[PDB]
Structures are given as structure tokens and as C-alpha cells.
Amino acid sequence: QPMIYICGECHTENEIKSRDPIRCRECGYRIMYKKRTKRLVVFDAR
Amino acid sequence: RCPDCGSTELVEDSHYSQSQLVCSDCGCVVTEGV
Amino acid sequence: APIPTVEEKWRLLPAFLKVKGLVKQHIDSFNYFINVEIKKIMKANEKVTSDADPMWYLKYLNIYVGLPDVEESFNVTRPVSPHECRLRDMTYSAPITVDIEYTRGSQRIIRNALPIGRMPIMLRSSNCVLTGKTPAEFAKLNECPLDPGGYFIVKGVEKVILIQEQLSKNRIIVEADRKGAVGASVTSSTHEKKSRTNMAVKQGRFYLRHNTLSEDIPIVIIFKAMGVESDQEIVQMIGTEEHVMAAFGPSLEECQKAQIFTQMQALKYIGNKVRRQRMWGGGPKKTKIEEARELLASTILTHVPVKEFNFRAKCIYTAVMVRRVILAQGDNKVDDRDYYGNKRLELAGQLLSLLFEDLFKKFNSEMKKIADQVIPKQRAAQFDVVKHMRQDQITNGMVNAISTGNWSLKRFKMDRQGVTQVLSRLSYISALGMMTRISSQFEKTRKVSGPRSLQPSQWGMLCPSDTPEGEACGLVKNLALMTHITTDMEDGPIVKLASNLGVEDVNLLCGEELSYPNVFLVFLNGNILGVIRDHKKLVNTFRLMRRAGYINEFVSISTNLTDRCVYISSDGGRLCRPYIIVKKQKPAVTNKHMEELAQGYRNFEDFLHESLVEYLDVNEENDCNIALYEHTINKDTTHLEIEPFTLLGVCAGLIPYPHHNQSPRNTYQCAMGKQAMGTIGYNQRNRIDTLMYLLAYPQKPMVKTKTIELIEFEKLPAGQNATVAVMSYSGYDIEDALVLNKASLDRGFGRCLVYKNAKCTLKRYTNQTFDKVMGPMLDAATRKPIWRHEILDADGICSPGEKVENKQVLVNKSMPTVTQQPQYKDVPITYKGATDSYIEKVMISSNAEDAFLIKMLLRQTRRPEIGDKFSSRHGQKGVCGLIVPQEDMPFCDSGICPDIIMNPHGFPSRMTVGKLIELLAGKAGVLDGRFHYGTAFGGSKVKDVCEDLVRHGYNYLGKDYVTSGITGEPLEAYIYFGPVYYQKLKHMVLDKMHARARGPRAVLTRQPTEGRSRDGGLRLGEMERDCLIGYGASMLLLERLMISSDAFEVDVCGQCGLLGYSGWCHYCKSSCHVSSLRIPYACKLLFQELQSMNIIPRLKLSKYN
Amino acid sequence: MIIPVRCFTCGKIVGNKWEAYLGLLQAEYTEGDALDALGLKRYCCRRMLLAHVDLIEKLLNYAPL
Amino acid sequence: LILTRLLVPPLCIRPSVVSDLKSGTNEDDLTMKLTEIIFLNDVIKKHRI
RNA sequence: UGCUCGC
Ligand SMILES: Nc1nc2c(ncn2[C@@H]2O[C@H](COP(=O)(O)OP(=O)(O)OP(=O)(O)O)[C@@H](O)[C@H]2O)c(=O)[nH]1
């Protein structure tokens, strides 16, 4: 299963599997955020 | 198992800051308090 | 003919803020520490060698701190931003390296770059990456340009070293004792030893007391021991006044009672009163007289130096001290400790210097021990320090001292606590005010009520109104807007100029000249510099030379005519304030100089060099005459106040028209503004803290002080302007409460955001096993994840964008139980919360230890409701009492309905006319599209805003014709409408709401836990028990304190009176006399503890009848 | 952060008059005459537009992008 | 009045926390004091022997 | 244990 993440400075979609050293291509930053979910979320305008 | 109905559906459900292992079928409180 | 006034004079304040001011103090101190002081410390311990195997040494050449880097990469460094250190929960430090030369096998081996430690780098310092950066480059580094900086980042947390306040060292203090005896004390402190020696008059004669003497000895014996043996010379040194001789007579008589008449006899008598420091190693060989002479020369009065066993200066010093005691024994001229002229402020620089010196000495001692243990017995393989230079010592020491905040220096015997504190990120004002905090040496634990008072010496230096309301009232203070802390000087040219100015040497003349009325003593940092005549010329020449630039501008000179002492202070930590020099009823600063400053021709340094503005110390300003304004300048005026509103601090600067309000109101306003909710910085979105409060639509105030423009608060506001009408409505605003409009809250007014952090760690243990996150446990019945694991993604980590409910897992963490197949038990991170939260972001990082750190930023959007605390920027804290609809709100002719209705009854008891003035100025400003100023001791007058109101067609007093919304009929009295800058506080009813079921209990004592985060219950205190006793409710007290709290049923044996178990007594080996008994569990615990203490309680039970 | 759509007190639509107000600031108009030309008679909308700080661009400068 | 035996209290008065996050446990001071007393008794017996 | 707060 392709697990995707976003770098902190390049902001490119990187696919890494379990037990991998947290890194990103074409750079060396080590802050990796998770993309937003695709599930529907309901909000109230109140 | 539940002491009343004999079911094995014992779930740990904390009700308002009270840890409590209770049967899920008849609601019999098996254990409470930690 | 009024004196001309320089209108642009206040322009001197921002220029001063360009090089100095609020945050530059700690920055400059840290830079001086890492650039100059560290090199001096390294030079002081440049060579270290061991006694065994001579001709071996380790010589330090030069030490460097470098740029901050991270040791994440394998044996490779990498530049790291402070925000990255905040995210990764690591420290922001730079590698302390040093180049050295040593001898391995008697062959000299040199190293040019060998790291030895890691120094935590203060933000915005010289070596910090944030300095010399543009706001765009700050955005590239995810750092706010308006961030004050100056704080350390350790393990992801922001620590600030508070400015320490202490008494000045090497100063005579004349004070009364517990029994009323007026004695003296001097704490002579050198770079090595600090010794407080006292002098008492307990029996009409002066005894000298020191920690190195078994019993206090007469002062005349010490005089005879220090070289001067003639009693006439002693009396001349003490004084020639008749009352002085009459007071000193008993001491001479007591000395003549004994047979002490020579130096040898006095030294022997002193040595008899000397006790060995618990069998000091080494053969004494008749050191009694030698020990006495060494204690007199070195231990006693360390700050007074003896050239070569010549106690002339020390004799003169103790004679002056005795004379001061004699003079104080008459008229009660007792010096006060709260006088800030005798106070010294230690910044982070001096503390870090002492800590680095201690750590380097410990490292050198450890290296010498390793050398002594390794070199003489190991092998022909020559020992080298490089194989034993542990680099974690200094790093761990610095990290622990900065994080924990407790400093234990055995070399100085200093045991301090609370030195570093967590930087408060409630708002920009909170951090900006906490950065300029100052703690007291009193270290509050008791009701002293002697330093807690507001002394007049705090003028211009410390803020009078800004103080934490509570137990820390008066002992935690804030610096003023315009203030500076001095550093240490070389003290050479001062001595040279003093010697060249006619100061006669004290060794050339006897002490009788000290008793002359026209002879004035000149001191220097507690050392007797000499004597002088016509001290006016000396003071004028010294001040003129300081103004010329040949003497440092921070060297202070003061004169005390009561004691006739000229004090010359050059030590660091003294508070100084800039003042405009006034010569012959006309200030040196003119309109042309201010025009040149505005055009950029000159700066504040040019004003300093051209003898226009000079720094004055508290001791120096004690003798100077300062004028508040130009019209106050008279013939006897030496200086002019730059700006009066600089008296207030940073937090006090937010108060509009503070001189129209009461001082407790200003204090409460500062305390609440330290907790005001609002934006933190431009990087508040990428910032992930444990608790953050943000405002949906922050607005800058309409009535803004010049301090607000100086601190750039308008760029980061922490409140909103609402159309407040001062009136009584529905009786839901009785005591400090306020009524909010439902339509206003519905349209975004007061909307707030609460961001919380949830952090989890997946660390590798000693064994080759790691914490792993399992996927969502899908339900086989529906082929979907369960309600608990609903929000989890495919990797077992909750994905941002969804809502989290109570008792739901965010990270499905499972950890092994071994440290053959690994056995994993689940320890998921469940979300404890009354309301739902939304995940904004999930950050996953990896440390050098292969531990994965996962941080989820939960967001909650909250609307003002009943129970939310609101402030009005005037100390008028209030709680929302009722939320009425828009139609129920009263309306004016224009149709404007008020958002906040406040009670008028709060005004008369508190006299907050400043609030009314702010309301009027804000109304005028929103009418004419202007921003009025509420500057302290100034600002826009009432007449101007009244004219602005009458020009726009509104009433000149704010009161407008208003029709009641409920009945539809006009009100009999006009309502005071106007825009007021209300700020919401972090105190919310949702977070403070608590309810306790049976819940959990403590293991030791089976009672509810303490806090709300621990699901604790409310405690019935001793006073509540007293009230229940007074009411006489025995059954209610029994049910509360026994039945509902710690009820238990024990088994007591009626034969021996001891406690049994399960209806059986092990003591008597029987069960016939065992009976059940109800009891509090704490009582059973007490009985068991008493039985452990051999205090056996024997219970004789009986029937209830 | 951003200009609110509705006024807190009255409720007049004010979010659509923000950027144009900035245009009036890019022009030679002052604060008062611009607020008058925008049609804000009551002082509540004048306070809403005048006391508002535009922090959205400062945050977008720190946005991922 | 002169003690020759020491009454060690039950575990209810001496709660022990099993901190599985590290290789150690949280114990009260009374347990450490009793441990030191037992060690001193053993050392005295060893010196007597 | 420390400390900042809330009255
Ligand atoms: N330095 C430090 N000492 C603590 C801390 N928590 C407790 N202590 C010490 O432990 C004593 C109080 O213990 P408690 O706070 O009752 O411990 P507890 O909360 O019952 O511990 P748990 O059962 O693990 O929750 C104090 O005298 C402190 O010296 C802490 O976070 N840091």
C-alpha cells in the first residue's frame, strides 16, 4: 500500500514504507507531514 | 464471562472518568474502580 | 515668557531602542559571554597537569563556539533552524571546540579542531542564524520577524533566564539586630571567596564576628594584631569627636584589662580563637600565629587588598566602619536594604560564565584524575588525553542547568533554583513582558513585606504598576521602557584619573584626617581609594571627563554628605537611565539636534558623545536634580527627563490613559494582559506547542499608546473593539458581569481557536526490537474500522482533517514486553476530551536514536458563552452573565445595537475614568477616521475629542438618545455608547468545568486524585470541616468524610486490639473475637504506620448500645 | 487573520469592501473620506474596516505552497 | 524502649510503581531505608565473623 | 518535585 507524505520545504509527495529513515529526495530536510484525508467531513456553519 | 447472563462480551468502557469493565449484552458491571 | 519646549524630544526614545531597549540586554550579555568572557575563562585554566609523571601537560590555545549545528547525521553536522529544533524536540546548540597541544610520549602533539562540548545558542545572538536576516529570510526559516528572541531552546522547549537581583558586594551595611543593637556587616566577595564579617556593640564595646573564629574578639585586639599597636593611633583612626571617644572608651578599657599590647600577643590571642577545618591535611608545625595572620590578611576583608602583609588599608577600612557604627549609634540613620542603589542585576551572561567556569574546572579535574590513574601503570603505550576527553560532560551540564533550572556550584557554594522558566506563549505581549522580568533574591516563601513595597528608587528603572498579583506581589518586577544595565569596566583609567586629581594616599596620613569635617573619603567598588578636600571640584571634573569620553559613560560617581563619602562605582549590573543634560536653565538638546536626528544626520551615540544626553545611575541621580518638563526647569537643575511615559514598562504600556485610573486597576490589567488571547506571530501556523490560543478576527486598538507603536503590538493584536454601552440591563450584570449580544457572537465576535499538541514516541530499546504501529483493526462484520479506530489511516496514524471524539485512538502504538518471539502489548494514545477536536496537521520526525516522534495538532473552534472571562484593557475583568438576542438589545437613532453591556456600578468604587476617556477617544476616532493616543501623562485631551464629536453631529459627552428594545419606549436617561477594546482571556468555562463520579483512587490512600487531568475530586478542606462542625450537621460530615471518601471495613480482634484479615487474627491465632468495623481508610493507614513506629494502638471494641 | 464578512454590531456586508478600501489607500484618499465614499455612515463599520489588520498575507508568506 | 526488631510495614504503606518505560521502578524512601538497615546488619555480621 | 497562573 502506497503511504504518501509531504516534505517541509520541497512539499513533494514522497512514498516511504515502514521502518524507513525519515528523509526526502533532492534535499535533506527531516520534517515529514501527512497529507489530508480523502474522507468526507461535515461542518456546521454555527 | 458475565456473572449474570454468562456472555463473554466484556468491554472496558470508561463512563465519565470511571474505568469500568462491563458486559456489553446485559450491561452487568463486572469490575469498576482502579 | 514661557521656556521654549522641544516637541520632537520624544524622538530620542525610538533611536535609543535601535541599539538598546527591551530585548537587547540578554542578547548583548550572551554575546559578551561567548566572545570575551569564555576566552578569559579558558585563559585562566589554559594549562592543566598531573603531579605524577612530571613534564606532562595539556595546554589550551584557543576555544571556539562556531555556528549552531545538529548531530543527527552520522558523524556529519548540518545547519538547523530554531523552528526545526522546536519541532524535533532537540536542543539548539553549537559545538564548543578548542585547539590544544599536549605531550603523548614527551613528543608534542597538537590538535587544531577538537570538539569538547555543546553550548546552547541564545536566539538572535551573534552566532545565532536568525541575526542579520530579513523578514523574507525569516519566512524561509519559519521564524516570526517580530519575535523578541533572547531565549534558549532545549529539547524543544523555550527557556528564559530571568534577570537575578541581589545585594551589592563589598559594601558596609549598618543595620539593627534582633535585640535592637545597631551593628555592621560587610560581605567581602572576591573572585574566589565570599566572607561576611560582622561587628556588634552587644555590651557597649565592639566585637568582630567571623565564621573562621570560635568566639568574637574585641576590635582593639584586631587593631593591635594588624600592625598598629599604639592606642592613640587607633583612637585617631576611629575619630576625634568627644562622643566618639566616649563610646570607644569601653573597648580600650576591655583591651587594657588583658595583657595584649603587642602584635605578637594579639596574634596569639587570635590564633587561640582559631579552630582547624576538621583536621586539615598536612603537618601544622606551629601555625597558630601564622594561621591568625593568614586569616587577617586573606580571609578577613578579602576585598581590601594587602600589598605585602601591610594591613594599613585594612586598618583604615575597619576604623571607618567603627566610626560609621559610632555615628549610627546616635541618630538612627540606619541604611535600608530596599534601596536599589545597592542592588545588582545578574543577566544570563554572568550566570553562564560562572557555570562554564565550574564545568571547565570539573573537566580539568577529571582529566587530571584520569591521567594520574592511567599514565604510571598502563603500558609502554603512551597515554593521551584525546582518548579520554569526554565531550558529553559540558553538554549535559549545560542542558540540565538550562532545562531543570537548578544551579549547584560547589566551587562557589551557590544553590539556586528557578533560574530558568518556560517562556509563556499565551500572546506576543506575554512573551515580550516575560523577557524583561526580574526575580528577587528573597525567593518568596514567607511574608517579608519589606522588599515587596514600591520604593522611590525604582523611578525610571522598573515599572511600578507591572507586578504579578498574588503571592509574588512585589518580588517579581519588570524593567522600564527606557533602561539599561551596565557591564564591567577595566577600572584602570578611573584609578589613574583619581590619583591625578589630587586624591592623597591613605598610607601617607594618619586616621585623624578622617575625622575632619572638610575631608571626604573617596571609594572604588568598596575599596578605600583615598581622601580628598573640596569634593565639588573632584565630582565636577570627573563628570566632565566622563562627558568628554576619556572615562566610560557607565562609570557612576555619587557623594554622601551625611557620611562624607564619595562613591565611584564601575562594576556591572547597575541600572542606568539616559537624561538630557541641563546647563544654566537651558537643555543642551535643541530643536536643531532633533531635526538632525529625524533626518538621519546623527544617532543616539552622537548625542552621547556631544555631551547632550548622559547615563545616570541611582546613586548618581540621588545627588542630581531632574526636571520632568521644560516648564519645571529652575536654576538648580542638572538634568531633564526625556519622556515621562517611559516610567511604565511593556505590559503597562497597553493601558490607555493609565494616569486616570487606580493603581490596582493597572496591576490587574497588566496581569490579565499577560494572559490576553491573540496572535503570537507570523509563524503561528507552523508552530506546534502544547497549548495555543488564537483569535479569529483580531483588531488593533483605536486608542493606542506610543509604546504600542514602539513594540509593534498593532501588528499582532490580542483583542477586538466592540461597541460597548455602559448601562444596567436585565440584572444579569450585577457584580463585574457583562451581557453579550447573540447576533454579535453569531457573526464572529469573540470567536477563538484552541490548539493542543499530542506527541508520541516510538523508540528503539537495547534489544533489537522497536515500537511499531499497527493498522486499523477492521471489523470483520462490516469490513470497516471500529468506532475507536475510525479516524486512523492505513498506517495506524490519525489523518488530519477529521474530527476526534472522546476515547478515540490517535496513534495505534504497540510496544514489546520482552524489553523467543516478540510479544507486543497495545498502549494507544487515546484522546481525553469533553468536546470534539479537529486534526490540523500531523508531523512525523526521526531523531538520531531511530525514535519516531509523531505530533498531532488538534484544533477546537470555540464561541463565547456563559462563563468565558473577558477583559476591557482597564482591569475590569468580567464574566458573560447573559447572551440576549439582537432585538432585545437597546438601539440608538442610527440603529446600532451594543455588543457588550457592562455594569456602571463598577466605576465609582474603582474610579476608572481612564476607561471613559478611552471610550470617548475611540468614538471620536472611529467617527473621524483617526487613531487617538492614550499616552501616559499626555495623549489626546478631552476637549479635542469633544470637538470631534460635536463636529460629526454626535453628543459631546458620548451619551446618546436610546430607545429600549424590549418595550419600544425611549429610556429616561441617555446611554453611554462607544467602541471599547475588549480582550478575551484564556480562562474558559469549558476547560474549568469539572465533575467527579466515583472514579479512580490513589494507591497509598484510597481517596480521589488531586487534579482535573487526573480525574480528581474536590477536597473538603479543614475550614469546610470547621463550617460543618459549626452547623452541627454530624451525619452530613460523616457521610462526606467517611462514607463517600475512604470508607472501608476492617477486622479488629477484641482480645488483643489489633487489626485482623478475613475474620482472623494472626497475633492470637484465633477468630472468635474478630469483628468487622467501619473505618476511614486513612485511619487504618495511620494505625498501621503507628504500629510500624512501635506506637501500637489497641482498640477496645464494644456494642453500639 | 482575514477581514470578517459581517459587521459585529449591525451586520452590514463589509468583507466585499476591504480590497477596494485598500485601493482607496493605494489612491490619495485618507481614512475618513475613503470610509465615507465606501458608504459606511455608522461608526461601527468604520471601526470594523479601520481597526482590521490584514494578517492573511503574512501567514501565506509562511504557507507551504 | 530499646528496639531489637524492626517492624517492616505492609506493601500498602509502601506503594511501588512499575515504570516499564525504563529499567527501574519507583519505590518509596521507607523501602530504601529498610534495605540499608538490612545491608548494615549483614555488614556487621560479616565484620563480626 | 519544581514553577506560571486563576480569587
Ligand atoms: N522533579 C520532579 N519531582 C516530582 C514530580 N512529580 C512528583 N515528584 C516528587 O514526588 C512527590 C510527589 O509525588 P506524587 O506527585 O504524588 O507522585 P504521583 O503523581 O502519585 O506518581 P504516579 O503514581 O506515577 O502518578 C514530590 O515530593 C516530588 O518531589 C516531577 O514531575 N518532577
Ligand SMILES: Nc1ncnc2c1ncn2[C@@H]1O[C@H](COP(=O)(O)OP(=O)(O)OP(=O)(O)O)C[C@H]1O
Ligand atoms: N490568597 C487568597 N486567599 C483567600 N482568598 C483569596 C486569595 N486571593 C484571592 N482570593 C479571593 O478573591 C477575593 C479578593 O478580592 P478583593 O481583594 O476583595 O478585590 P481586589 O482583588 O482588590 O479587586 P480590586 O483591585 O479592588 O478591583 C476574595 C477572596 O475570596
Ligand SMILES: [Mg+2]
Ligand atoms: Mg473574585
Ligand SMILES: [Zn+2]
Ligand atoms: Zn523535500
Ligand SMILES: [Zn+2]
Ligand atoms: Zn487477637
Ligand SMILES: [Zn+2]
Ligand atoms: Zn457595521
